[PDB]
Amino acid sequence: APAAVDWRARGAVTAVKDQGQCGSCWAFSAIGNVECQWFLAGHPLTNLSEQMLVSCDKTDSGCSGGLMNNAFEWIVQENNGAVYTEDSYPYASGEGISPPCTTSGHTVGATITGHVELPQDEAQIAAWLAVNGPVAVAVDASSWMTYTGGVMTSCVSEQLDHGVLLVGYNDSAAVPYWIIKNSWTTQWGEEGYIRIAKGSNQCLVKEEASSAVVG
């Protein structure tokens, strides 16, 4: 695989968002992945709706958590593949309470047809990402609250609790690293991103990697 990849160089990644006090990271991870896959399929980069998932995907648990794979399945199996635009279905859960689902008044911004669940293998995830784009992953982010920069090599890796988006890596650095988009504003980390060490399953990053499929 290439020595380093960063999908931001293709303009394939939307701006860092703010999930607020809702436990909706699963939706931010899934939607961020869809946004990138939609762009890479040859469509304009479009901000898509986390709120659609938080409010309407009843296989997941709104502000009380969920799974990116469940979200991708819900989109395809219950919403005809459709993902609404953020502009037409804006986020409304930042205080920690998700409003009920609304079915009318929204605009389809992207469609997906399925999703892939990747091997639990950092090299194979990296190789897939190098060709196919950003990857939704679950991590243990319980230790991340005060991160301000650098390659995190001290990640409590006890239990998955947070969904994020792998956007790249650099295998050439002395401590190789993943590049990860978070959903805690640009005031957190490195303009809203974090680098974690790559190759030792830091933060359990290899354990639940997946991507939507567009087309």
XYZ file of N, CA and C in Angstrom:
645
model
N 0.874 -1.213 0.000
C 0.000 0.000 0.000
C 0.887 1.232 0.000
N 0.380 2.409 -0.341
C 1.241 3.596 -0.292
C 1.777 3.829 1.112
N 2.905 4.536 1.177
C 3.508 4.822 2.472
C 2.649 5.745 3.321
N 1.783 6.536 2.695
C 0.925 7.468 3.411
C -0.220 7.845 2.494
N -1.373 8.122 3.113
C -2.614 8.490 2.435
C -3.326 9.520 3.292
N -4.002 10.469 2.647
C -4.819 11.441 3.377
C -5.925 11.928 2.442
N -7.115 11.414 2.654
C -8.261 11.744 1.732
C -8.648 13.213 1.781
N -8.188 13.970 2.791
C -8.413 15.405 2.741
C -7.729 16.021 1.531
N -6.659 15.397 1.025
C -5.968 15.938 -0.144
C -6.815 15.877 -1.411
N -7.824 15.017 -1.448
C -8.784 14.938 -2.541
C -9.992 15.829 -2.316
N -10.060 16.526 -1.185
C -11.253 17.276 -0.841
C -12.447 16.394 -0.591
N -12.215 15.192 -0.086
C -13.256 14.191 0.033
C -13.928 14.179 1.385
N -13.513 15.052 2.305
C -13.964 15.005 3.694
C -14.621 16.334 4.043
N -15.835 16.269 4.572
C -16.517 17.481 4.996
C -15.890 18.019 6.279
N -16.312 19.222 6.638
C -15.832 19.878 7.839
C -16.165 19.071 9.086
N -15.338 19.265 10.114
C -15.544 18.638 11.409
C -16.823 19.173 12.032
N -17.626 18.268 12.557
C -18.909 18.570 13.150
C -18.847 18.474 14.675
N -19.986 18.753 15.306
C -20.095 18.792 16.761
C -21.320 17.986 17.168
N -21.100 16.796 17.721
C -22.218 15.984 18.172
C -22.844 16.520 19.445
N -22.162 17.425 20.139
C -22.700 17.953 21.376
C -22.794 16.886 22.452
N -23.839 16.990 23.274
C -24.031 16.130 24.428
C -24.850 14.890 24.114
N -25.125 14.630 22.850
C -25.811 13.419 22.430
C -24.795 12.315 22.152
N -25.122 11.082 22.552
C -24.269 9.935 22.271
C -24.500 9.389 20.874
N -24.337 10.259 19.887
C -24.649 9.988 18.492
C -23.402 9.810 17.627
N -22.246 9.519 18.226
C -21.027 9.376 17.439
C -21.164 8.299 16.373
N -21.933 7.240 16.650
C -22.181 6.206 15.648
C -22.763 6.802 14.373
N -23.643 7.789 14.518
C -24.246 8.433 13.358
C -23.265 9.365 12.663
N -22.462 10.115 13.425
C -21.444 10.956 12.808
C -20.421 10.127 12.045
N -20.011 8.989 12.604
C -19.072 8.104 11.919
C -19.674 7.559 10.633
N -20.897 7.032 10.714
C -21.542 6.464 9.534
C -21.764 7.520 8.456
N -22.301 8.676 8.842
C -22.597 9.712 7.861
C -21.322 10.279 7.267
N -20.295 10.493 8.087
C -19.043 10.976 7.540
C -18.505 10.030 6.493
N -18.600 8.727 6.761
C -18.191 7.740 5.773
C -19.029 7.843 4.502
N -20.360 7.950 4.639
C -21.212 8.088 3.451
C -20.834 9.329 2.660
N -20.638 10.451 3.350
C -20.300 11.693 2.672
C -19.083 11.500 1.780
N -18.056 10.840 2.310
C -16.824 10.624 1.555
C -17.047 9.654 0.397
N -17.767 8.558 0.639
C -18.007 7.582 -0.418
C -18.840 8.186 -1.546
N -19.805 9.046 -1.195
C -20.648 9.708 -2.187
C -19.798 10.613 -3.074
N -18.930 11.417 -2.454
C -18.004 12.249 -3.220
C -17.116 11.399 -4.127
N -16.570 10.306 -3.594
C -15.615 9.519 -4.362
C -16.269 8.774 -5.510
N -17.583 8.597 -5.470
C -18.342 8.026 -6.571
C -18.587 9.021 -7.695
N -18.158 10.262 -7.531
C -18.262 11.260 -8.568
C -19.386 12.254 -8.390
N -19.763 12.569 -7.167
C -20.824 13.512 -6.860
C -20.234 14.663 -6.063
N -20.888 15.816 -6.046
C -20.367 16.935 -5.257
C -20.341 16.585 -3.777
N -19.299 17.039 -3.091
C -19.218 16.808 -1.655
C -20.399 17.487 -0.971
N -21.140 16.713 -0.191
C -22.415 17.142 0.358
C -22.460 16.818 1.843
N -22.856 17.799 2.658
C -23.125 17.544 4.067
C -24.436 16.789 4.201
N -24.385 15.676 4.860
C -25.521 14.757 5.031
C -25.982 14.733 6.487
N -27.128 14.090 6.719
C -27.884 14.270 7.957
C -27.633 13.161 8.979
N -26.888 13.489 10.037
C -26.854 12.630 11.218
C -28.218 12.554 11.890
N -28.962 13.667 11.904
C -30.230 13.682 12.623
C -31.203 12.661 12.050
N -31.175 12.455 10.735
C -32.000 11.411 10.141
C -31.788 10.085 10.859
N -30.527 9.704 11.072
C -30.242 8.447 11.765
C -30.640 8.510 13.229
N -30.237 9.574 13.917
C -30.492 9.670 15.349
C -31.988 9.576 15.634
N -32.809 10.257 14.834
C -34.250 10.284 15.066
C -34.987 9.083 14.489
N -34.545 8.544 13.348
C -35.399 7.642 12.579
C -34.938 6.193 12.575
N -33.666 5.931 12.856
C -33.132 4.574 12.828
C -33.424 3.919 14.169
N -34.474 3.102 14.215
C -34.908 2.503 15.467
C -34.182 1.195 15.780
N -33.251 0.760 14.922
C -32.361 -0.340 15.281
C -31.221 0.145 16.155
N -30.904 1.421 16.083
C -29.950 2.060 16.965
C -30.718 2.829 18.034
N -29.983 3.491 18.934
C -30.563 4.017 20.167
C -30.374 5.521 20.306
N -30.362 6.238 19.191
C -30.372 7.691 19.247
C -29.187 8.241 20.017
N -29.485 9.084 21.000
C -28.462 9.678 21.844
C -27.911 8.718 22.883
N -28.411 7.486 22.941
C -27.900 6.475 23.853
C -27.021 5.450 23.155
N -26.639 5.696 21.912
C -25.633 4.897 21.236
C -26.197 4.115 20.061
N -25.292 3.394 19.410
C -25.635 2.643 18.222
C -24.373 2.105 17.578
N -24.540 1.562 16.377
C -23.461 0.911 15.642
C -23.510 1.381 14.206
N -22.349 1.731 13.661
C -22.311 2.161 12.268
C -22.861 1.087 11.339
N -22.543 -0.181 11.583
C -23.059 -1.212 10.681
C -24.579 -1.262 10.718
N -25.182 -1.100 11.901
C -26.641 -1.034 11.990
C -27.173 0.143 11.190
N -26.490 1.282 11.278
C -26.937 2.476 10.575
C -26.927 2.263 9.067
N -25.848 1.679 8.539
C -25.795 1.422 7.106
C -26.916 0.478 6.685
N -27.165 -0.552 7.493
C -28.249 -1.484 7.209
C -29.603 -0.789 7.244
N -29.818 0.092 8.226
C -31.095 0.797 8.295
C -31.314 1.649 7.054
N -30.287 2.388 6.645
C -30.415 3.239 5.467
C -30.893 2.417 4.278
N -30.252 1.271 4.047
C -30.559 0.478 2.862
C -31.895 -0.231 3.013
N -32.127 -0.860 4.166
C -33.276 -1.749 4.338
C -34.555 -1.020 4.715
N -34.461 0.133 5.378
C -35.637 0.863 5.827
C -35.823 2.207 5.147
N -34.774 2.800 4.583
C -34.880 4.126 3.982
C -34.557 4.139 2.492
N -34.650 2.986 1.826
C -34.454 2.890 0.380
C -33.097 3.424 -0.056
N -32.099 3.291 0.810
C -30.767 3.759 0.517
C -30.549 5.244 0.705
N -31.595 6.006 0.987
C -31.516 7.457 0.937
C -30.913 8.030 2.210
N -30.074 9.038 2.026
C -29.535 9.837 3.124
C -29.872 11.296 2.838
N -30.611 11.925 3.744
C -31.024 13.302 3.532
C -29.856 14.266 3.718
N -29.958 15.417 3.071
C -28.980 16.470 3.274
C -29.071 17.013 4.693
N -27.951 17.497 5.189
C -27.937 18.140 6.499
C -28.790 19.421 6.444
N -28.700 20.155 5.347
C -29.462 21.392 5.257
C -30.960 21.137 5.405
N -31.456 20.028 4.855
C -32.882 19.729 4.889
C -33.307 18.932 6.116
N -32.351 18.397 6.876
C -32.653 17.643 8.091
C -31.503 17.952 9.080
N -31.498 19.155 9.614
C -30.334 19.596 10.394
C -30.264 18.947 11.771
N -29.072 18.987 12.342
C -28.861 18.392 13.649
C -29.614 19.181 14.696
N -30.265 18.457 15.585
C -31.110 19.070 16.595
C -30.977 18.348 17.926
N -29.879 17.625 18.140
C -29.706 16.823 19.345
C -28.539 17.283 20.207
N -27.954 18.449 19.927
C -26.725 18.850 20.592
C -26.847 18.993 22.090
N -28.048 19.247 22.601
C -28.250 19.346 24.037
C -28.423 17.986 24.695
N -28.540 16.916 23.915
C -28.634 15.583 24.466
C -29.982 14.914 24.324
N -30.986 15.577 23.742
C -32.288 14.965 23.472
C -32.545 15.017 21.972
N -32.787 13.863 21.380
C -33.113 13.791 19.956
C -34.609 13.987 19.746
N -35.019 14.841 18.817
C -36.438 14.934 18.479
C -36.928 13.687 17.776
N -38.235 13.468 17.772
C -38.802 12.353 17.010
C -38.572 12.519 15.518
N -38.620 11.386 14.819
C -38.442 11.352 13.373
C -39.544 12.121 12.664
N -39.163 12.817 11.600
C -40.111 13.378 10.646
C -39.797 12.826 9.265
N -40.830 12.407 8.544
C -40.648 11.844 7.212
C -40.798 12.796 6.093
N -41.397 13.954 6.293
C -41.658 14.913 5.230
C -40.719 16.110 5.333
N -40.549 16.798 4.204
C -39.786 18.028 4.164
C -38.289 17.874 4.005
N -37.803 16.704 3.615
C -36.375 16.480 3.504
C -35.998 16.207 2.052
N -34.714 16.370 1.761
C -34.157 16.307 0.414
C -33.070 15.240 0.410
N -33.112 14.335 -0.562
C -32.140 13.244 -0.630
C -30.818 13.795 -1.139
N -29.764 13.642 -0.335
C -28.441 14.115 -0.692
C -27.494 13.032 -1.179
N -27.780 11.770 -0.871
C -26.931 10.664 -1.286
C -27.749 9.389 -1.179
N -27.321 8.366 -1.917
C -27.881 7.027 -1.795
C -26.744 6.024 -1.687
N -26.914 5.043 -0.807
C -25.989 3.925 -0.687
C -26.741 2.637 -0.981
N -25.998 1.608 -1.382
C -26.593 0.327 -1.733
C -26.253 -0.792 -0.761
N -25.295 -0.583 0.123
C -24.896 -1.618 1.049
C -23.714 -1.134 1.851
N -23.027 -2.062 2.511
C -21.815 -1.710 3.239
C -20.940 -2.944 3.346
N -19.659 -2.696 3.575
C -18.658 -3.739 3.757
C -18.111 -3.659 5.170
N -17.814 -4.817 5.732
C -17.212 -4.933 7.047
C -15.813 -5.484 6.825
N -14.804 -4.718 7.230
C -13.424 -4.993 6.855
C -12.749 -5.923 7.853
N -11.680 -6.599 7.426
C -10.919 -7.461 8.341
C -10.395 -6.702 9.548
N -10.223 -7.434 10.644
C -9.642 -6.899 11.877
C -8.118 -6.940 11.772
N -7.607 -6.082 10.899
C -6.209 -6.136 10.506
C -5.850 -4.751 10.002
N -4.960 -4.076 10.728
C -4.634 -2.697 10.424
C -4.023 -2.541 9.039
N -3.156 -3.468 8.628
C -2.576 -3.355 7.295
C -3.635 -3.505 6.210
N -4.567 -4.445 6.384
C -5.601 -4.634 5.369
C -6.588 -3.470 5.353
N -6.909 -2.904 6.523
C -7.742 -1.705 6.571
C -7.052 -0.567 5.844
N -5.760 -0.376 6.106
C -5.018 0.700 5.462
C -5.006 0.520 3.955
N -4.783 -0.710 3.490
C -4.735 -0.957 2.058
C -6.083 -0.685 1.414
N -7.163 -1.080 2.086
C -8.498 -0.823 1.568
C -8.771 0.671 1.520
N -8.435 1.370 2.602
C -8.634 2.811 2.666
C -7.843 3.527 1.582
N -6.632 3.045 1.292
C -5.797 3.712 0.304
C -6.482 3.790 -1.049
N -7.273 2.781 -1.395
C -7.934 2.733 -2.689
C -9.360 3.253 -2.608
N -10.058 2.842 -1.589
C -11.535 3.027 -1.533
C -12.063 4.156 -0.668
N -11.193 4.817 0.084
C -11.577 5.991 0.830
C -11.739 5.775 2.360
N -12.216 6.831 3.018
C -12.316 6.812 4.479
C -13.200 5.694 5.008
N -12.854 5.237 6.210
C -13.418 4.036 6.814
C -13.992 4.396 8.180
N -15.236 4.002 8.431
C -15.814 4.153 9.763
C -15.196 3.127 10.701
N -14.797 3.557 11.902
C -14.239 2.654 12.898
C -14.761 2.983 14.283
N -14.860 1.952 15.099
C -15.112 2.102 16.519
C -13.776 2.126 17.250
N -13.695 2.954 18.287
C -12.509 3.049 19.118
C -12.935 3.139 20.575
N -11.961 2.899 21.451
C -12.050 3.296 22.854
C -11.504 4.713 22.953
N -12.405 5.689 23.082
C -12.053 7.098 23.201
C -12.230 7.599 24.619
N -12.328 6.689 25.585
C -12.573 7.115 26.953
C -11.453 8.004 27.486
N -10.237 7.890 26.939
C -9.075 8.657 27.383
C -8.809 9.904 26.543
N -9.714 10.275 25.645
C -9.416 11.262 24.611
C -9.805 12.691 24.971
N -10.465 12.908 26.083
C -11.090 14.192 26.365
C -10.151 15.373 26.401
N -8.903 15.165 26.828
C -7.944 16.262 26.920
C -6.880 16.224 25.831
N -7.066 15.423 24.784
C -6.100 15.383 23.700
C -6.057 16.729 22.989
N -4.843 17.245 22.792
C -4.638 18.484 22.065
C -3.699 18.354 20.878
N -3.105 17.196 20.653
C -2.235 17.011 19.509
C -1.153 15.989 19.784
N -0.466 15.621 18.713
C 0.566 14.611 18.747
C 0.025 13.251 18.344
N 0.929 12.286 18.245
C 0.538 10.910 17.985
C 0.222 10.259 19.319
N -1.055 9.974 19.539
C -1.478 9.327 20.758
C -0.966 7.910 20.726
N -0.182 7.579 21.741
C 0.399 6.265 21.941
C 0.037 5.742 23.325
N -0.816 6.481 24.031
C -1.222 6.095 25.377
C -2.742 6.040 25.416
N -3.311 5.162 24.592
C -4.761 5.011 24.483
C -5.341 3.888 25.339
N -6.164 4.217 26.335
C -6.794 3.151 27.111
C -7.593 2.365 26.071
N -7.340 1.078 25.906
C -7.950 0.315 24.881
C -8.639 -0.868 25.551
N -9.635 -0.560 26.351
C -10.390 -1.549 27.106
C -11.739 -1.868 26.487
N -12.459 -0.872 25.977
C -13.817 -1.122 25.523
C -14.175 -0.120 24.445
N -14.738 -0.619 23.354
C -15.212 0.269 22.308
C -16.319 1.142 22.869
N -16.232 2.438 22.588
C -17.275 3.343 23.055
C -17.502 4.537 22.139
N -16.882 4.603 20.965
C -16.943 5.828 20.184
C -16.728 5.490 18.711
N -17.536 6.074 17.839
C -17.353 5.932 16.407
C -16.673 7.166 15.843
N -15.714 6.931 14.941
C -14.938 7.982 14.298
C -14.677 7.569 12.860
N -13.882 8.354 12.152
C -13.652 8.129 10.730
C -12.159 8.154 10.435
N -11.618 7.026 9.957
C -10.245 7.012 9.452
C -10.209 7.721 8.111
N -9.363 8.737 7.988
C -9.207 9.431 6.714
C -7.846 9.237 6.078
N -6.899 8.624 6.771
C -5.566 8.472 6.226
C -4.644 7.816 7.225
N -3.372 7.751 6.840
C -2.332 7.182 7.690
C -0.987 7.649 7.157
N 0.043 7.418 7.963
C 1.424 7.664 7.537
C 2.273 6.553 8.141
N 2.663 5.600 7.295
C 3.505 4.482 7.708
C 4.981 4.833 7.751
N 5.362 6.021 7.308
C 6.780 6.352 7.214
C 7.331 7.010 8.475
N 6.466 7.505 9.356
C 6.912 8.168 10.568
C 7.540 7.165 11.538
N 8.372 7.679 12.440
C 9.040 6.792 13.388
C 8.029 5.989 14.191
N 6.976 6.650 14.668
C 5.780 5.972 15.160
C 4.720 6.158 14.082
N 4.424 5.131 13.294
C 3.408 5.268 12.251
C 2.068 5.596 12.886
N 1.188 6.248 12.114
C -0.057 6.736 12.690
C -1.223 6.673 11.718
N -2.405 6.518 12.307
C -3.667 6.768 11.635
C -4.038 8.238 11.792
N -4.800 8.744 10.820
C -5.373 10.083 10.866
C -6.880 9.918 10.978
N -7.472 10.495 12.024
C -8.866 10.245 12.387
C -9.630 11.551 12.544
N -10.781 11.644 11.863
C -11.726 12.742 12.042
C -12.648 12.424 13.208
N -12.721 13.338 14.177
C -13.645 13.218 15.291
C -14.812 14.187 15.078
N -15.782 14.143 15.994
C -17.005 14.939 15.941
C -17.190 15.772 17.200
N -16.088 16.348 17.689
C -16.065 17.103 18.939
C -15.612 18.540 18.709
N -15.943 19.088 17.539
C -15.546 20.427 17.094
C -14.081 20.509 16.694
N -13.732 21.591 16.002
C -12.336 21.828 15.649
C -11.513 22.355 16.811
N -12.135 22.654 17.950
C -11.382 23.082 19.121
C -10.712 21.918 19.827
N -11.130 20.699 19.537
C -10.535 19.518 20.127
C -9.441 18.996 19.205
N -8.355 18.524 19.801
C -7.329 17.854 19.024
C -6.648 18.762 18.023
N -6.351 18.181 16.865
C -5.639 18.866 15.795
C -6.686 19.337 14.793
N -7.253 20.507 15.071
C -8.382 21.038 14.300
C -9.497 20.006 14.151
N -9.741 19.262 15.227
C -10.820 18.296 15.265
C -10.412 16.891 14.876
N -9.146 16.693 14.501
C -8.570 15.404 14.147
C -7.662 14.894 15.258
N -7.407 13.586 15.216
C -6.450 12.948 16.113
C -5.598 11.986 15.310
N -4.320 11.908 15.677
C -3.423 10.883 15.181
C -3.197 9.881 16.298
N -3.402 8.606 15.994
C -3.094 7.541 16.939
C -2.080 6.601 16.313
N -1.276 5.973 17.161
C -0.278 5.045 16.655
C -0.958 3.927 15.884
N -0.271 3.456 14.849
C -0.769 2.449 13.926
C 0.129 1.224 13.981
N -0.492 0.061 14.151
C 0.193 -1.212 14.150
C 0.091 -2.000 15.441
N -0.455 -1.437 16.515
C -0.559 -2.126 17.797
C -1.994 -2.136 18.311
N -2.962 -1.988 17.415
C -4.384 -1.966 17.760
C -4.700 -0.912 18.819
N -4.045 0.240 18.710
C -4.281 1.322 19.651
C -5.740 1.733 19.632
N -6.300 1.890 20.816
C -7.696 2.275 20.981
C -8.654 1.258 20.371
N -8.182 0.039 20.114
C -8.989 -1.032 19.522
C -9.427 -0.731 18.091
N -8.642 0.086 17.393
C -9.050 0.642 16.100
C -9.321 -0.419 15.037
N -8.721 -1.596 15.136
C -8.922 -2.576 14.071
C -10.212 -3.369 14.216
N -10.938 -3.231 15.321
C -11.909 -4.261 15.665
C -13.253 -4.146 14.955
N -13.657 -2.953 14.503
C -14.973 -2.777 13.896
C -14.913 -1.685 12.827
N -14.281 -2.024 11.711
C -14.073 -1.111 10.598
C -15.036 -1.452 9.472
N -15.636 -0.436 8.867
C -16.584 -0.709 7.796
C -16.776 0.531 6.943
N -17.438 0.332 5.809
C -17.719 1.428 4.899
C -19.023 1.170 4.161
N -19.781 2.232 3.949
C -20.878 2.179 3.003
C -20.349 2.009 1.586
N -21.231 1.513 0.719
C -20.983 1.391 -0.711
C -21.964 2.291 -1.436
N -21.435 3.155 -2.295
C -22.237 3.952 -3.214
C -22.107 3.334 -4.593
N -23.235 3.138 -5.273
C -23.241 2.578 -6.630
C -23.175 1.074 -6.591
